[PDB]
Amino acid sequence: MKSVITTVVSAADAAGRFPSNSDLESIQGNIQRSAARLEAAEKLAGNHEAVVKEAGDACFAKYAYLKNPGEAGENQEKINKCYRDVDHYMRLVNYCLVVGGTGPLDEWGIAGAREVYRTLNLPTSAYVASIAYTRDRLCVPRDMSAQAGVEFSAYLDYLINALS
Amino acid sequence: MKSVITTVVSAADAAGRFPSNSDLESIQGNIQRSAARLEAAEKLAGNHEAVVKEAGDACFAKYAYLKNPGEAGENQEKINKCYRDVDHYMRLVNYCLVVGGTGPLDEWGIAGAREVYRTLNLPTSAYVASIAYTRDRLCVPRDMSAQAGVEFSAYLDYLINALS
Amino acid sequence: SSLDEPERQVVMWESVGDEKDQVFKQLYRQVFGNAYLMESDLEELLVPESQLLMGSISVKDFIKRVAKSDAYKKRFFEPCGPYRFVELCTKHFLGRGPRDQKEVSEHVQRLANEGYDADVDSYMDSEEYMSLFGENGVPRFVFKGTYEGNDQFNRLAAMRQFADGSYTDTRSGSTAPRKAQKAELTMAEGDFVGRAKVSRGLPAETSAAKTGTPPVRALKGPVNPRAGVRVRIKVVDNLYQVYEIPPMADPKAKVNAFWAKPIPS
Amino acid sequence: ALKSFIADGNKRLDAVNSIVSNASCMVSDAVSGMICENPGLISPGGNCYTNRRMAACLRDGEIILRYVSYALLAGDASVLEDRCLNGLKETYIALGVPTNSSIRAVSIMKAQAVAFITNTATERKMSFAAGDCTSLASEVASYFDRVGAAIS
Amino acid sequence: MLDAFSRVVVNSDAKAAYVGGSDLQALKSFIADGNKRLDAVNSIVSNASCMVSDAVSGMICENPGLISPGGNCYTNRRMAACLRDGEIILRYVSYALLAGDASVLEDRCLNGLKETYIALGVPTNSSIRAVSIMKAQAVAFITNTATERKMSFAAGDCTSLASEVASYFDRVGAAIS
Amino acid sequence: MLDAFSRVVVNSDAKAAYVGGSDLQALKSFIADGNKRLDAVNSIVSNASCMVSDAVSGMICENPGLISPGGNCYTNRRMAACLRDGEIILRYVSYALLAGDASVLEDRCLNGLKETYIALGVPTNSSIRAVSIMKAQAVAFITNTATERKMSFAAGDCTSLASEVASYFDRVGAAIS
Amino acid sequence: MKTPITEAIATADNQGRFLSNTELQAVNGRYQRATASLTAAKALTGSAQRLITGAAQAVYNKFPYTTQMPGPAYASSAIGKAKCARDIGYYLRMVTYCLVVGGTGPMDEYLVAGLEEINRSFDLSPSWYIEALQYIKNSHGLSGQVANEANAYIDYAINTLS
Ligand SMILES: C=CC1=C(C)[C@@H](Cc2[nH]c(/C=C3N=C(/C=C4\NC(=O)[C@H](C)[C@H]4CC)C(C)=C\3CCC(=O)O)c(CCC(=O)O)c2C)NC1=O
Ligand SMILES: C=CC1=C(C)[C@@H](Cc2[nH]c(/C=C3N=C(/C=C4\NC(=O)[C@H](C)[C@H]4CC)C(C)=C\3CCC(=O)O)c(CCC(=O)O)c2C)NC1=O
Ligand SMILES: C=CC1=C(C)[C@@H](Cc2[nH]c(/C=C3N=C(/C=C4\NC(=O)[C@H](C)[C@H]4CC)C(C)=C\3CCC(=O)O)c(CCC(=O)O)c2C)NC1=O
Ligand SMILES: C=CC1=C(C)[C@@H](Cc2[nH]c(/C=C3N=C(/C=C4\NC(=O)[C@H](C)[C@H]4CC)C(C)=C\3CCC(=O)O)c(CCC(=O)O)c2C)NC1=O
Ligand SMILES: C=CC1=C(C)[C@@H](Cc2[nH]c(/C=C3N=C(/C=C4\NC(=O)[C@H](C)[C@H]4CC)C(C)=C\3CCC(=O)O)c(CCC(=O)O)c2C)NC1=O
Ligand SMILES: C=CC1=C(C)[C@@H](Cc2[nH]c(/C=C3N=C(/C=C4\NC(=O)[C@H](C)[C@H]4CC)C(C)=C\3CCC(=O)O)c(CCC(=O)O)c2C)NC1=O
Ligand SMILES: C=CC1=C(C)[C@@H](Cc2[nH]c(/C=C3N=C(/C=C4\NC(=O)[C@H](C)[C@H]4CC)C(C)=C\3CCC(=O)O)c(CCC(=O)O)c2C)NC1=O
Ligand SMILES: C=CC1=C(C)[C@@H](Cc2[nH]c(/C=C3N=C(/C=C4\NC(=O)[C@H](C)[C@H]4CC)C(C)=C\3CCC(=O)O)c(CCC(=O)O)c2C)NC1=O
Ligand SMILES: C=CC1=C(C)[C@@H](Cc2[nH]c(/C=C3N=C(/C=C4\NC(=O)[C@H](C)[C@H]4CC)C(C)=C\3CCC(=O)O)c(CCC(=O)O)c2C)NC1=O
Ligand SMILES: C=CC1=C(C)[C@@H](Cc2[nH]c(/C=C3N=C(/C=C4\NC(=O)[C@H](C)[C@H]4CC)C(C)=C\3CCC(=O)O)c(CCC(=O)O)c2C)NC1=O
Ligand SMILES: C=CC1=C(C)[C@@H](Cc2[nH]c(/C=C3N=C(/C=C4\NC(=O)[C@H](C)[C@H]4CC)C(C)=C\3CCC(=O)O)c(CCC(=O)O)c2C)NC1=O
Ligand SMILES: C=CC1=C(C)[C@@H](Cc2[nH]c(/C=C3N=C(/C=C4\NC(=O)[C@H](C)[C@H]4CC)C(C)=C\3CCC(=O)O)c(CCC(=O)O)c2C)NC1=O
Ligand SMILES: C=CC1=C(C)[C@@H](Cc2[nH]c(/C=C3N=C(/C=C4\NC(=O)[C@H](C)[C@H]4CC)C(C)=C\3CCC(=O)O)c(CCC(=O)O)c2C)NC1=O
Ligand SMILES: CCC1=C(C)/C(=C/C2=NC(=C\c3[nH]c(/C=C4\NC(=O)[C@H](C)[C@H]4CC)c(C)c3CCC(=O)O)/C(CCC(=O)O)=C2C)NC1=O
């Protein structure tokens, strides 16, 4: 688990000592950035069903060859499962916007990612086409604030920095 | 206290007769078994702390919902009353190995078990999940002799059919 | 070589005076079995612990000499059987258990003629430890993804009971009149390892569901909280009890005062 | 069933003895001090008419004060929830209970209870000890808004 | 190795539930006491070496059976081990207090502790007695009611964290017995 | 065997009398509150199963020697007999509450119970704690004062029935002590 | 027990008599003294955490050999210390029962009956309990007739120990 809390007290646990002012100064950034982070969380959570509606076909618009027979999502019992897999990733980034890290991402999503995407012939480039389409649909006046946008967007291309 | 001696002196007092060679030939088999049946009760008595701890830790690990609130495995004192409830059953099978028969089991633990676990909400499915671990967890070349483990495994199956 | 297990491996790079004891207590937890030490167990292994400060002696040769000291020999060599000693070297240095019994029958043979030093150096000089990390890697219980034996899943993991915790390889923190260990992974030739050290010997990853809190107080609105306990010494005595809620009363217009009943008609 | 209180005794048990000794006195104020600012309740069409809705409000102030004094006796707001707050909003809107009166009548109890343990009641004065119950006064102020946020 | 920010994550992952605005209102209180959380622990670790020495000496002043030979604190090998056992209990209740979670306290240093102690022969009742002194000391510091040595602080109270420390110390005693 | 109505007709049988004014007024009051008498009995037998488990376990947690080897409730056969010795007690008290007269548990339950328990070896000083717990449960059900279960009732008062059922539960402890 | 209500009934019962006016004035003397008795019982109950552990230390300061001398009768162990504090809690609780009832009834049947055989057998001295009882009489912190009623039952327990 990677939060702000989970790294520094484990480093103090590896130091085997009490939490000093190094440990206490890192927690002070949470109350500076809870006003930055979780405003985009319920902005996601009130809009995630529409976000997966417009991002799930953006990879279909870039890659029409998936609907050909012999490919990954080619019948409608996988096209809803196509929207289901990316709906996990928006639910995952909703979790790490709360914890302030990449804790749920590289324990549930990226932890164990690229093995099943290789052995089930899943196009990894077609994963991030839905993610990059969510990265450029931001409106820093409209959707969330300006600092809440870059708290949100830096997690999203981290997925592309983890899948590639 | 159903043993081999108490079977025949109560069959003979039913008819009202003297012990004949239908009563003396029975106690000859009591000699032909006590050289190996008492071997298991010698091992079980000096080892039972390592067995009752391994028996309960193969019960709560599978039945992990019993430690939720509202259940029968609430606190530490209930779990401390759960090893007390099992170390009786490893003592009663020690008492059956020395009387020869199934005397102490069917009148101290079994007799009245259906109303003391149904009233106190004790699941009778968890008891068989721990005793069958001890039966499955048996190994006759190292831990016993080949004729003790024939009969030591035969009294645990007397519990399991009488608990199920 | 895939799936869940630990990734952080301390490496001891370019070591200055505070990244010493970051890895040194991880050494002293691992090879000494989180026992207790730290006067003339730490006056004792001074002539190797000073040596690995310029890189003049590597971490490979450090544990090689630490096992030759009698911190280790007075803890894991006298109060042990011949089966316990081959058990502990696989734990402390190699981070596993014995894969088979002819590996045990090799290692107790190697104790029996070439000695104790030549045995414990052979625990190093295989291609196991070098495939683990090499010289600079700190020994740690690593998990393989693909294991070649499900006995050796928990021949490995019936060693590590609670690395995240307290596992007490001796009978106390290096106790004084040291009772013998029991070599509890005996396991002669054709058998498995028991279940009782599997579910306690796995790390904090498959703990999928958790428990739920119950509501705390009585939900019947006409309450009666005794809650009474308040122990002083044995004289356990009852606190501010809040009785009950009572029903009120009965308005009963006995007067009535309606139009006269006896209209004499 | 012990109430699990580890340190700083003889004030928390003294705080509830200044509350449940006049718990029927407090409810009879809040069932009668509500009406001078909202007199539509004994008006026909209000929720306090035909002499049983007035009587069911006496049970309502009793079961909301005992289940907050058990919360004071435990020292944690857990049995303020595990027998009282689980779905108490969904019975009031399905009945037609007005939420304006219930959010004001709890603050009658909030102003009454912090005068009791600080011994600033204008009518009766307890013969209490010397010290302060003002860490407790922040605790009961943080207990009357938990039902102020549940019933909203 | 979890925390209070993730405590509301892990249950919502178990139903595949998106976290809403009302779920983080507990975390809205958890950022509200953001100086108050650190306001407690720097009193604890400032007096920690006095705390563990006061706890084990009051544990053994009442119980001279351990300083009887054959006890469990008779030898200095035992005695230096004994309050070194106690400071890790002090170290992890602080570690649980920094996370706002009873997570670090029991995944490390507590699973496998009851069966360790019965293999040491440690009387567990004196360990209950030591932690109860350790519980009573910490709530004197973080409410500034340490009548031997007060310290300067801010204005207000920590009644909720006083309940939080006592709800960390109890599961220490609930697990070793 | 005798109800409240037949109690009156054997008192006016001694006088060779009829029933008139002063002796029918207290009997019409039984009929008047007769709906509350049914309404209280149903509150007991609806949840009598958890009333005999809590009362037996309340005696054991106060007296830990009853489950010692050589305790009276040691084996399962003796424990299961205890769990129905208390249910026979609760069955006959709910008969005397229903009929409004204590002449049914006096005849078929109480008469000869003291000489029966001292023969078998049942401790009678610990059998009365199990009934006094059941007395506190039964009066906390015909008045809605049970802490973990609230039952809907019509508005009114039933403290007269609370003293009627407490007279039955006390004479069970007076017939065996 | 030996309440003034039960010692007035048992007086009239041993004479085969109805309750005359001799007995009703004995009952009314209990009712006059009751409000000075029930406040001392209320005051000692809440102040018991200080008065027990304060009085336990008053014995160890006058008789310090009871913390150092080995043996089962002394409080030189944690078992013996916790049983010494238990004994002072018996004496304080019996005083609050004698204040509630009125008169030395409860502590006669529960505490002083057969006590000389217990101290003589288990080797524990009654002078340890007198120093603990003189502490509570010096530090209960009441005045008026609330103290004069409470000290009348501490002094009864001292007069049975000597
Ligand atoms: C939870 C996170 C979150 C987002 C990433 C955005 C993404 C987003 N934008 C819009 C919908 C919109 N989004 C924008 C915003 C912009 N258009 C631009 O060209 C600019 C780059 C940017 C800021 C001016 C506009 C102008 C619309 C309406 C028309 C349109 O789709 O462009 C919609 C509704 C359906 C849809 O059109 O897809 C969604 C989900 N909204 C959110 O709630
Ligand atoms: C089912 C039918 C049945 C029986 C009737 C008995 C018959 C019987 N008796 C003895 C055997 C014996 N019986 C005796 C007893 C005595 N000898 C004396 O000189 C005393 C007068 C008398 C004492 C009472 C002795 C001493 C032995 C020899 C065995 C021994 O000494 O232990 C043996 C063992 C013989 C052997 O192994 O060599 C048998 C089978 N057993 C049975 O299974
Ligand atoms: C000599 C014969 C003998 C026995 C066979 C047992 C049988 C037995 N167990 C319990 C009593 C119990 N038994 C258990 C044990 C368990 N409960 C569960 O839910 C798990 C399935 C299991 C864990 C292994 C527990 C937890 C209690 C106490 C339940 C309670 O009253 O809270 C009781 C009631 C008396 C008591 O509370 O102790 C009896 C008679 N006891 C005996 O004296
Ligand atoms: C070389 C020997 C060898 C095996 C025999 C298998 C068996 C095996 N599985 C796991 C471990 C596991 N194995 C599974 C697999 C499954 N769970 C299910 O419900 C399905 C039946 C099945 C999928 C088809 C899962 C889900 C884990 C858990 C991984 C973890 O806990 O981290 C482990 C411990 C290592 C680990 O945690 O990854 C082993 C030895 N794997 C091996 O390496
Ligand atoms: C990371 C988790 C972790 C812990 C929780 C502690 C727990 C712990 N304590 C001891 C070891 C010990 N712990 C104690 C402590 C006590 N015994 C008593 O009777 C007193 C009540 C109590 C003192 C307060 C003593 C006396 C020993 C040494 C016993 C011996 O002589 O072997 C050991 C074995 C190693 C050793 O012996 O040094 C471990 C793992 N240490 C840890 O590393
Ligand atoms: C009196 C009752 C009694 C039992 C029923 C057993 C049960 C039992 N088995 C093991 C222990 C074990 N049990 C086995 C199992 C086996 N061993 C083999 O070589 C076979 C292939 C296989 C037979 C099924 C193994 C491999 C171990 C050792 C693993 C370990 O270290 O825990 C242990 C732990 C202690 C030990 O190390 O021995 C216990 C209590 N022991 C008892 O005292
Ligand atoms: C024949 C047996 C029978 C039952 C026991 C119930 C069971 C039941 N309850 C509800 C449904 C409900 N039940 C309640 C509860 C209440 N509603 C109120 O107005 C009060 C405040 C409170 C009674 C104290 C509410 C609020 C709902 C709506 C959905 C919900 O909240 O569960 C539903 C869903 C559809 C429906 O309303 O019928 C059902 C099947 N229905 C049945 O047909
Ligand atoms: C119809 C008009 C009507 C009212 C407006 C209220 C009057 C009233 N009094 C108080 C204020 C109070 N109300 C009580 C309550 C009581 N005093 C007691 O001794 C009894 C236990 C109980 C009612 C008899 C107390 C103790 C205070 C604090 C008074 C003080 O400061 O001493 C408050 C809350 C503080 C405030 O907002 O002013 C209100 C609204 N009662 C009414 O009837
Ligand atoms: C027989 C030997 C014996 C002892 C050694 C002490 C040990 C001791 N200290 C305290 C109690 C305490 N101990 C401390 C700790 C300290 N106080 C400070 O201010 C320092 C910084 C720090 C080290 C001295 C604190 C703060 C309390 C709470 C009361 C107080 O403020 O002093 C308690 C009460 C805890 C409880 O009741 O659970 C005990 C038993 N008492 C004894 O009877
Ligand atoms: C890493 C170092 C670090 C700390 C140690 C704390 C120290 C600390 N606590 C509070 C501030 C506060 N502290 C308390 C709490 C307390 N005050 C008391 O007198 C009680 C002893 C204690 C209970 C635990 C309250 C109620 C506030 C105000 C709310 C807040 O600012 O968080 C403040 C702001 C007010 C001031 O300037 O004094 C500071 C700096 N914060 C930090 O950043
Ligand atoms: C050591 C073990 C131990 C226990 C098990 C409890 C047992 C217990 N419960 C009650 C007291 C009671 N017990 C019940 C029983 C129940 N409430 C319900 O709603 C259910 C139907 C049923 C239990 C499932 C009721 C209704 C009361 C009275 C009010 C109450 O306490 O809730 C009393 C009364 C006190 C007395 O008068 O002596 C006792 C001892 N207490 C203990 O010390
Ligand atoms: C066949 C089964 C059967 C029953 C279970 C009862 C059910 C029942 N109870 C009452 C009616 C009542 N029941 C009670 C009793 C109580 N009210 C309380 O608040 C106390 C908890 C409890 C005291 C024991 C009261 C006070 C009435 C009001 C009417 C009356 O007093 O006669 C009524 C008549 C009025 C009504 O509620 O509609 C009925 C039908 N009658 C039956 O015929
Ligand atoms: C279980 C029942 C039970 C109670 C009801 C309380 C009652 C109580 N409190 C104290 C004792 C005390 N009570 C208070 C309380 C207060 N002083 C104030 O200034 C505030 C107005 C008020 C709190 C609201 C204080 C400050 C002390 C002294 C400190 C202490 O003893 O802890 C005492 C001992 C002194 C005496 O009365 O002789 C008692 C019996 N304690 C109990 O055990
Ligand atoms: C309710 C009436 C009642 C009284 C009065 C009573 C006294 C009493 N005190 C006892 C023991 C004891 N009492 C003490 C107390 C002390 N020794 C000291 O050194 C201290 C100075 C002093 C404490 C102030 C000790 C140490 C024992 C243990 C003696 C032994 O078990 O051998 C015992 C022996 C059993 C036991 O409790 O372990 C009894 C019966 N018991 C009762 O039931």
Residues 6+ apart with CB under 8 A from C216: D74, D76, D78, D79, D80, D81, D82, D83
Ligand 8: residues with CB < 6 A are: D 22, 25-26, 28-29, 32-33, 36, 108, 111-112, 115, 120-124
Q: How many residues does chain A have?
A: 164
CATH number of the domain residue B157 falls in: 1.10.490.20
Q: Classify the C-alpha dihedral B55-B61-B63-B68 as positive or negative.
A: positive
Residue with token string 């010289």: C135
Answer yes or no: do C4 and A112 touch at CB < 8 A. yes
Q: Is the Cβ–Cβ distance between D40 and G79 less than 8 Å?
A: no
State how far residue C29 is from chain B, nearest Cα, in angstroms: 27
Chains G, C in contact, 3 or more Cβ pairs below 8 Å: yes
Sort A72 into a burial class: Cβ within 10 Å, 0-12 / 13-18 / 19+.
Answer: middle
Q: Is the CB of E156 under 6 A from ligand 10?
A: yes
State the distance from the centre of ligand 6 to the C-alpha of C194, rounded, in angstroms.
7
Cα gap F116→F114, rounded to integer Å? 5
Q: Is the CB of D100 under 6 A from ligand 13?
A: no
Cα gap F36→F161, rounded to integer Å? 9
> Which of B77, B115, B121 has the most F C-beta neighbours within 10 Å, making it the best mutation to test the interface with F?
B115
Residues 6+ apart with CB under 8 A from D42: D35, D48, D49, D54
State the distance from the centre of ligand 10 to the C-alpha of E42, rounded, in angstroms.
10
Nearest to B115 by CA among F38, D136, G46, F82: F82
Please spell the DSSP secondary structure of chain B, one letter per residue: ---HHHHHHHHHHHHT----HHHHHHHHHHHHHHHHHHHHHHHHHHHHHHHHHHHHTTTTTT-GGGGSTTSSS-SHHHHHHHHHHHHTHHHHHHHHHHHSSSTTIIIIISTTHHHHTTTTT--HHHHHHHHHHHHHS--TTTTS-TTHHHHHHHHHHHHHHHH-
Sort A89 into a burial class: Cβ within 10 Å, 0-12 / 13-18 / 19+.
Answer: buried
Cα gap G111→G159, rounded to integer Å? 13
CATH number of the domain residue E163 falls in: 1.10.490.20
Residue C247 alpha carbon, nearest atom of ligand 12: 19
Q: Is the Cβ–Cβ distance between D46 and D113 less than 8 Å?
A: no
The structure tokens listed for A13 are 């646990």
Starting from the CA of residue F39, give the closest ligand: 12
**Three-state secondary structure readout of C18-33:** CHHHHHHHHHHHHCCC
In order of A54, A108, C98, the CA distances from A3 in angstroms are 30, 14, 38
Cα gap F162→F142, rounded to integer Å? 7
Nearest Cα residue to atom 10 of ligand 6: C194
Chain centroid to Cα F27, Å, comes to 23
State the distance from the centre of ligand 2 to the C-alpha of F58, rounded, in angstroms.
58
One-letter amino acid of B145: S
- Please give the biggest Cα pair distance in chain F: 63
Q: C-alpha angle with apex A132: A128 to A137, nearest 5 degrees?
A: 150
The structure tokens listed for D67 are 């289940």
Q: How many CB atoms lie within 10 A of CB B9?
A: 11
Residue with token string 């011949």: C82
Cβ–Cβ contact B116 with F under 8 A: yes
Nearest to C196 among B58, B67, B69 (CB): B58
Nearest to B90 by CA among B35, B59, B146, B48: B48
Q: Is the Cβ–Cβ distance between B109 and F78 less than 8 Å?
A: no
Among B8, B20, B28, name the best residue to mutate to test ligand 2's pocket (greatest count of ligand atoms within 8 A of Cβ): B28
Chain centroid to Cα D34, Å, comes to 14
One-letter amino acid of B90: M
Q: Is the CB of D91 under 6 A from ligand 7?
A: yes
Task: Report the neighbours of C using a cutoff of 3 or more CB pairs below 8 angstroms.
Answer: A, B, D, E, F, G
Chains B, G in contact, 3 or more Cβ pairs below 8 Å: no
Cβ–Cβ contact E53 with D under 8 A: no
Residues in chain C closer than 8 A to A15 (CB atoms) = 21-22
Residue E18 DSSP symbol: P
Cβ–Cβ contact B53 with E under 8 A: yes
The structure tokens listed for F4 are 């409240």
State the distance from the centre of ligand 3 to the C-alpha of F74, rounded, in angstroms.
11
Residues 6+ apart with CB under 8 A from G147: G40, G140
Nearest to A33 by CA among A4, A75, A74: A4
- Please give the biggest Cα pair distance in chain A: 61
Residue with token string 């007296």: F63
Cα gap B9→B3, rounded to integer Å? 10
Cβ–Cβ contact B155 with C under 8 A: no
Q: Is the Cβ–Cβ distance between A71 and A65 less than 8 Å?
A: yes
Q: Is the Cβ–Cβ distance between C143 and C40 less than 8 Å?
A: no
Residues 6+ apart with CB under 8 A from C252: none
Cβ–Cβ contact F149 with C under 8 A: yes
Phi, then psi, of F53 in degrees rounded to 5:
-85, -40
Q: How many CB atoms lie within 10 A of CB D12?
A: 22
Q: Give the 3-state secondary structure of residue C263.
A: coil
Residue with token string 């004499």: C264
Give, for C196, the enclosing helix (H) or strand (E).
Answer: none
Q: Is the Cβ–Cβ distance between C98 and C158 less than 8 Å?
A: no
Phi, then psi, of C79 in degrees rounded to 5:
-90, 50
State the distance from the centre of ligand 5 to the C-alpha of E117, rounded, in angstroms.
8
**Structural domain that includes position E16:** 1-177
Query: Treating both helix axes as pointing N-terminal to C-terminal, what angle do E34-44 and E159-175 enclose, rounded to 10 degrees?
Result: 50
Q: Is the Cβ–Cβ distance between F111 and F54 less than 8 Å?
A: no
Task: Report the neighbours of G using a cutoff of 3 or more CB pairs below 8 angstroms.
Answer: C, D, E
The structure tokens listed for C203 are 């790390």
CA-atom Rg of chain B in angstroms: 18
Closest residue, chain C, to G90 (C-alpha): C235
Q: Is the Cβ–Cβ distance between E72 and E130 less than 8 Å?
A: no
Q: How many domains does chain F divide into?
A: 1
State the distance from the centre of ligand 10 to the C-alpha of E31, rounded, in angstroms.
13
Q: Classify the C-alpha dihedral B86-B87-B90-B91 as positive or negative.
A: negative
Q: Give the 3-state secondary structure of residue E176.
A: coil
Give, for A146, the enclosing helix (H) or strand (E).
Answer: helix A146-163
The structure tokens listed for G116 are 């000389």
Answer yes or no: do D7 and E157 touch at CB < 8 A. no
Residues in chain E closer than 8 A to G82 (CB atoms) = 62
Residues in chain C closer than 8 A to F144 (CB atoms) = 220-222
Cβ–Cβ contact F154 with D under 8 A: no
Answer yes or no: do A14 and C4 touch at CB < 8 A. no
Q: Is the CB of D56 under 6 A from ligand 13?
A: no
Residue with token string 């699973």: E111
Q: How many domains does chain A divide into?
A: 1
- The resolution, in Å, is 4.3
Question: Is E73 annotated as contributing to ligand binding?
Answer: no
Closest residue, chain E, to B75 (C-alpha): E174
**Three-state secondary structure readout of G85-133:** HHHHHHHHHHHHHHHHHCCCCHHHHHHHCCHHHHHHHCCCCCHHHHHHH
Residues 6+ apart with CB under 8 A from C58: C52, C135, C136
Cβ–Cβ contact E16 with A under 8 A: yes
Q: Is the Cβ–Cβ distance between E8 and E27 less than 8 Å?
A: yes
Closest residue, chain F, to D84 (C-alpha): F148
> Which of D2, D26, D84, D85 has the most C C-beta neighbours within 10 Å, making it the best mutation to test the interface with C?
D2
Q: Is the Cβ–Cβ distance between G99 and G38 less than 8 Å?
A: yes
Q: Is the CB of D1 under 6 A from ligand 7?
A: no
Closest residue, chain G, to D10 (C-alpha): G46
Nearest to E131 by CA among E63, E52, E45: E52
Q: Give the 3-state secondary structure of residue A117.
A: helix
The structure tokens listed for C38 are 């730290």
In order of C116, C138, E57, G140, the CA distances from C95 in angstroms are 19, 10, 39, 66
Would you tell me which residues 115-134 of chain E have a C-beta closer than 8 angstroms to some C-beta of chain C? 116, 119-121
Q: Is the Cβ–Cβ distance between E85 and E176 less than 8 Å?
A: no
State the distance from the centre of ligand 7 to the C-alpha of D96, rounded, in angstroms.
16
Please spell the DSSP secondary structure of E75-122, one letter per residue: SHHHHHHHHHHHHHHHHHHHHHHHHTSSSHHHHTTTSS-HHHHHHHT-
Q: Give the 3-state secondary structure of residue F22.
A: helix
Residues 6+ apart with CB under 8 A from B88: B109
Cβ–Cβ contact D2 with E under 8 A: no
A70: left (phi over 0), alpha (psi -120 to 50) or beta: left
The structure tokens listed for F96 are 């005397």
Cα gap C52→A133, rounded to integer Å? 53
One-letter amino acid of A26: S
Question: Which value, to the nearest 10 degrees, does the dihedral of the CA atoms of residues A117, A122, A125, A131 take?
Answer: -80
Answer yes or no: do B76 and E115 touch at CB < 8 A. no
State the distance from the centre of ligand 1 to the C-alpha of A130, rounded, in angstroms.
15
In order of E44, E140, E152, E155, the CA distances from E146 in angstroms are 11, 5, 12, 16
One-letter amino acid of G65: Y
Q: Is the Cβ–Cβ distance between A113 and A131 less than 8 Å?
A: no
Residue with token string 């060679």: B21
Experimental technique? cryo-EM
Residues 6+ apart with CB under 8 A from F169: F93, F131, F132, F134, F135, F138
Q: Give the 3-state secondary structure of residue F14.
A: coil
**Structural domain that includes position A107:** 1-164
Residue D91 alpha carbon, nearest atom of ligand 7: 21
Residues 6+ apart with CB under 8 A from C254: none
Cβ–Cβ contact D58 with C under 8 A: yes
State how far residue B64 is from chain C, nearest Cα, in angstroms: 9
Cβ–Cβ contact E25 with D under 8 A: no
Sort B36 into a burial class: Cβ within 10 Å, 0-12 / 13-18 / 19+.
Answer: middle
Question: Is A82 annotated as contributing to ligand binding?
Answer: yes
